[PDB]
């Protein structure tokens, strides 16, 4: 306590690769750990929280995980903040990003920030801290634009469902939210809701950020509700209810009883707020298809490339590649993004794709627009277009388009 | 940096009448040092964003955040309280006046607190020292300003007769406060309810006043010449009068004040003690506080419905500057009474009631 | 080309004011002094319509008297006024056909139900329709609402609606009424794939001004279930009943619209009628060679009127011509007509008092509308909600209590004229 008590705290979320199969199967790398821009999707939430003015945030990840990625923190992290890991057993998959804080709860003691993973942001934080601080409401949840994909829509059967935003312009409240889970036959709209805040902006080409700020005391309630699976999914919608169902008038007791938000007489509350906030630029969370855009929407960079070797006979530009990989005569790299020291054959073709770390392609081959998770391995002369490798996954001399290889079993 | 600011700050002092006024606002947490606590942060985000933020309760919120601050000091082993202390909160200073320029009511609760923390007893301890002065402040919230009100309220409904017409202008929690009294006292009264661009700060005292069943009336203050012949008293509440008897308010207030007596109308100033200064004001543009001009493109009847204007490009287009200065000054040959807690003095009688208090031997 | 044709639809709420619809028709009585016609045609004018066609059902020569008479039939006029009369209890529908039936439509055109009071231009939004239409004429219709509070007391059941528009094209993708019984609202979601930022609005007035295309009438001589504008046709559209066709709100968020269908309309509009809300279309304008001139507080008089001495008027008041007023009475926020006198030391209070009245000494009036020639005699009183015809006289001594109409024939109400007219009654 250097004379300063602290703001908020820090919550980053690094379930499952839930949706992004092909690469995260295997236990030998999570869905915390896929490199963007040849640096792992983790570096993103820390790096806007470090910037933020966070000196110290605390993580929660799987099991499996607890062992792989603070050794990517004590060797492999560039910033400078202090991350709490956290692994609780209960994690039963089952389990959602609610379900898991609940299980850490007795970490929390201010506000907090929920984050995840894959929580891909250049909004300036203090856009999203000060809307906070000055509306003070019971939450604040972060929306953007949805990504727009710059090659041709391949194949897109499982982009991030879609989302439906109602939001109060004036108070820039947030009053509806519902995905085509909790579907609707005839889709339906509370009119005891219209007769307060009788205008409600649509939104439908909207997409959320996993970015939310809740109050301090919104843990007391996941305490006590049990029923609260995923934040996205259970909590926010739960949150919104209450701002305007009347009868909804389930026990509220948990704002009044010594929150503590004067802290004696009561000049706060009374009344549950809800905002959101959009912006325009560099704002979204990979699920899969995201990870082929926010890794080519990732050079803003700037140049040069080190401690690799790409000998005579060989060209590559505006690529990013990382240490120690190497490129052998006549082939080509173009419009791609290769990991750490991999290993580029003899006349090969690797053009709009994706490549991760330790792997190694041998001669003669093309890769048009794919994804190779890391490990991997793809014999000579193979030909793959638009398909996924899965990890420490080899192929010999095959080819296909549109298709998912992996290590049978 | 500072001297180079400096040595800018000196040369806007030009051709321009508001060349020396300050424009230079933080409206963001943007590169905020880290001295800075977290309950002022919050403050200095309400004071640039906040519009209906009376100087009273600045004042108060002021100093509730203070001892919050002072609550989580901590002083280092090697030095005493009161050593050390005020140059942690004038390193908060130094941020909230970049939010927003600092009220005459905040300048004076800093200047007697800065006091205190030197006339504290060193002999004392942490806890002892913090437990007294944040009495020392709710003593002050009491006597100086919420006792204060409900003495100026009762002073002022005394003089408010059954059959007259009031007429405020822009919203004074004061002035709103004694209203809501003479209403529920019995006395029969109409207000009329002066408002002006571009903040339509009028129309939330409209509001509160209509919601206690006040027979109200509502017009900007180009209608002052054709509103003011129902009038019979005018009352305005200050951000602070000045030594000479002045009264430092919000913009129309001198031409209330004006339009009133050239048609007899009396100019009724309510208006805290603490909000006195030692200062004075030959003009209303030496000592002021600037707002946004690009307040007054929305031509609108609003101000957030983003509805565009004509002179969207001034800060582009040369030979065009849009301004809206944010008080000025009302000599005290206009000003009838003010309504101190000491009771209804002329407004001239100022510096006496400031040097009154300055009997802290 | 030159050509800005424009129906009106009279006599189709006809029903709601019933009591008094006997000797004069709805769309022929005052407001403020004035009839409701001439708000709404003042209206048309500002629009720059060049040709009316005016239905009728009820009193159509007593109807037509006027507009033939009216200054509206002079070659000053803007636009040439043409009477048409068809079967009573006109729906709006078959007044389509009817019109479709005549080949009268030469393009693009306006329609109102009742007697609209408005000084919105519409000069703007018809120019509005005319673009979007030129590049899609599948676009028929375009509607007019204004802007208000989901609680204003200009807003009631019938224009107590939801929209749901595109917020940048501004097209009513769905629509419904509000009936406290519909608790939800339900939209098809195959909209969202076709729409990208929708606003959904309660505070809308409806003000039920809707510019049509050429295509409406022959639209509407086809599906000829559609009867009511509102609950028919716009349904239709937007639950492609209709061949895929567009419509559009042109949401007004400043001057006045509304119009004249509810007692507790007519009380509405003429207080935010006496309050200038409608300028120019005030008393103090004088359109019809009245003498009126404001006076502070919003009180109204004419020229050659006599108020006694002792006598008081409060704020929002209106006097009418030729009116006495006896000694020691007050009236406040009261309409009255011309040639009209109250009696002495009596009270009125937020009432409707029309041409050619009497009142009796020492007598108590309060929110009830008063029709044109009505004695009441000394010592009797009248509480709100009351509602009285022409011709119809109450004896000394008497009261009347709430909502209590009444009539000077023998249909459905409990009327009878002579004196007294209660508990004492004549014709029973």
């Known amino acids: 306590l250097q004379s300063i008590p602290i703001e908020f705290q820090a919550v980053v979320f690094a379930g499952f690769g839930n949706s992004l199969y092909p690469l995260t199967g295997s236990d030998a790398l999570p869905k915390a750990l896929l490199p963007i821009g040849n640096k792992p999707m983790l570096h993103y939430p820390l790096y806007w929280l470090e910037a933020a003015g966070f000196t110290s945030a605390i993580l929660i990840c799987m099991e499996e995980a607890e062992a792989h990625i603070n050794a990517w923190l004590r060797s492999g992290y560039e910033g400078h903040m202090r991350i709490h890991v956290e692994a609780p057993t209960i994690l039963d998959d089952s389990k959602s990003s609610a379900d898991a804080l609940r299980a850490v709860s007795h970490l929390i003691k201010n506000d907090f920030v929920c984050l995840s993973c894959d929580s891909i942001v250049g909004l300036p934080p203090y856009t999203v801290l000060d809307k906070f601080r000055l509306d003070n409401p019971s939450a604040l949840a972060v929306y953007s634009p949805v990504l727009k994909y710059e090659h041709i829509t391949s194949q897109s059967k499982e982009i991030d469902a879609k989302q439906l935003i109602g939001i109060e312009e004036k108070t820039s409240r947030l009053l509806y939210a519902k995905s085509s889970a909790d579907v609707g036959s005839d889709f339906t709209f509370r009119m005891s809701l219209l007769w307060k805040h009788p205008r409600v902006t649509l939104n439908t080409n909207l997409s959320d950020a996993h970015i939310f700020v809740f109050k301090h005391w919104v843990i007391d309630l996941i305490r006590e509700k049990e029923s609260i699976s995923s934040i996205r999914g259970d909590l926010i919608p739960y949150l919104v209810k209450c701002q305007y169902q009347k009868s909804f008038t389930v026990r509220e007791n948990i704002q009044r009883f010594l929150s503590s938000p004067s802290s004696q007489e009561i000049k706060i509350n009374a009344l549950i707020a809800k905002d959101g906030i959009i912006c325009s630029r560099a704002n979204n969370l990979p699920n899969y298809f995201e990870l082929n855009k926010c890794i080519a929407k990732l050079t803003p960079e700037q140049r040069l490339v080190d401690v690799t070797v790409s000998e005579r006979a060989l060209v590559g530009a505006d690529c990013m590649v990382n240490e120690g990989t190497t490129i052998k005569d006549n082939s080509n790299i173009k419009k791609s993004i290769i990991g750490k020291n991999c290993v580029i054959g003899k006349g090969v073709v690797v053009s709009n794709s994706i490549l991760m770390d330790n792997i190694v392609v041998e001669d003669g081959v093309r890769l048009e627009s794919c994804i190779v998770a890391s490990g991997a391995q793809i014999g000579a002369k193979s030909k793959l277009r638009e398909c996924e490798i899965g990890v420490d996954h080899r192929v010999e001399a095959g080819r296909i388009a549109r298709g998912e290889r992996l290590v049978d079993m | ?361 | 080309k030159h050509a800005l044709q424009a129906i009106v639809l009279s006599d189709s709420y006809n029903y709601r004011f019933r009591p008094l619809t006997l000797d004069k028709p709805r769309c022929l009585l005052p407001l403020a002094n004035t009839p409701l016609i001439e708000y709404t045609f003042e209206f048309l004018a500002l629009a720059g319509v060049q040709e009316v066609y005016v239905f009728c059902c009820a009193h159509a020569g007593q109807i037509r008297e006027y507009i033939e008479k009216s200054k509206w039939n002079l070659p000053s006029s803007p636009f040439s006024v043409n009477t048409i009369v068809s079967r009573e209890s006109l729906s709006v529908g078959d007044a389509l056909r009817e019109l479709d039936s005549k080949q009268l439509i030469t393009s693009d055109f306006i329609l109102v139900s009742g007697d609209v009071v408005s000084n919105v231009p519409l000069n703007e939004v018809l120019k509005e329709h005319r673009k979007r239409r030129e590049d899609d004429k599948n676009a028929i219709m375009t509607m007019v609402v204004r802007e208000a509070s989901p609680f204003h007391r200009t807003r009631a059941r019938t224009e107590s609606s939801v929209f749901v528009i595109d917020k940048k094209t501004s097209q009513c993708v769905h629509y419904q009424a509000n009936e406290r019984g519909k608790h939800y609202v339900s939209m098809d979601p195959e909209i969202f794939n076709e729409h990208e930022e929708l606003e959904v609005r309660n505070d809308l007035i409806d003000c039920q001004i809707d510019i049509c295309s050429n295509d409406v009438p022959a639209l509407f001589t086809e599906n000829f279930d559609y009867q009511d504008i509102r609950k028919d046709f716009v349904y239709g559209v937007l639950t492609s009943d209709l061949l895929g066709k567009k419509i559009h709100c042109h949401v007004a968020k400043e001057n006045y619209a509304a119009r004249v269908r509810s007692l507790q309309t007519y009380d509405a509009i003429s207080k935010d009628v006496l309050s200038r809300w409608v300028y120019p279309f005030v008393p103090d304008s004088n359109l019809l060679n009245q003498t009126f001139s404001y006076q502070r507080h919003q009180i109204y008089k004419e020229e050659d009127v006599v108020l006694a001495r002792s006598c008081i008027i409060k704020a929002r008041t209106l006097i009418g011509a030729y009116t006495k007023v006896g000694d020691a009475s007050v009236v406040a926020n009261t309409i009255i007509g011309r040639n009209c006198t109250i009696g002495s030391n009596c009270s009125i209070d937020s009432a409707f008092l029309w041409e050619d009245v009497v009142i009796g000494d020492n007598c108590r009036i309060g929110k009830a509308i008063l029709a044109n020639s009505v004695k009441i005699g000394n010592n009797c009183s009248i509480e709100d909600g009351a509602i009285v015809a022409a011709g119809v006289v109450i004896g000394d001594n008497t009261i009347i209590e709430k909502n209590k109409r009444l009539t000077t024939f023998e249909s459905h109400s409990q009327g009878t004229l002579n004196d007294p007219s209660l508990v004492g009654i004549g014709g029973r």
């Open chain 2, 1 to 361: 940096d500072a001297n180079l600011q400096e040595k800018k700050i000196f040369e806007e002092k030009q051709v321009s009448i508001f060349s020396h006024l300050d424009w230079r606002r933080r409206r963001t947490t943007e590169n905020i040092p880290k001295d800075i606590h977290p309950a002022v942060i919050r403050l200095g985000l309400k004071l640039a964003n906040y519009k209906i933020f009376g100087s009273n309760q600045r004042c108060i919120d002021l100093l509730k955040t203070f001892k919050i601050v002072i609550q989580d000091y901590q002083t280092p082993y090697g030095t005493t309280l009161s050593r050390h202390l005020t140059t942690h909160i004038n390193s908060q200073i130094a941020y909230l006046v970049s939010t927003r320029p600092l009220s005459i009511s905040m300048g004076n609760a800093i200047r007697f607190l800065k006091l205190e923390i030197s006339v504290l007893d060193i002999d004392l301890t942490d806890d002892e020292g913090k437990e007294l002065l944040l009495e020392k402040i709710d003593s002050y919230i009491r006597d100086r300003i919420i006792i204060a009100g409900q003495v100026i309220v009762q002073a002022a409904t005394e003089k408010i007769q059954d059959g007259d017409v009031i007429l405020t202008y822009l919203h004074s929690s004061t002035v709103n406060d004694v209203l809501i009294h003479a209403k529920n006292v019995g006395k029969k009264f109409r207000v009329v309810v002066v408002d002006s661009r571009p903040e339509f700060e009028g129309r939330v005292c409209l509001k509160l006043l209509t919601e206690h069943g006040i027979e109200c009336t509502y017009v900007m203050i180009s209608a002052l010449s054709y509103i003011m012949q129902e009038v019979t008293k005018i009352f305005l509440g200050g951000h602070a009068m000045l030594s000479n008897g002045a009264l430092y308010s919000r913009a129309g207030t001198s031409l209330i004040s004006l339009l009133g007596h050239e048609s007899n109308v009396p100019v009724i100033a309510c208006c805290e003690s603490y909000k006195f200064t030692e200062r004075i004001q030959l003009d209303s543009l030496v000592y002021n506080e600037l707002a946004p001009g690009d307040q007054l493109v929305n031509m609108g009847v609003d101000d957030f419905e983003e509805k565009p204007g004509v002179l969207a490009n001034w800060k582009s287009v040369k030979n065009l500057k849009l301004l809206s200065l944010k008080y000025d000054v009302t000599p005290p040959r206009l000003i009838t009474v003010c309504v101190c807690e000491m009771g209804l003095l002329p407004s001239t009688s100022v510096p006496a009631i400031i040097n009154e208090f300055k009997q802290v031997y």
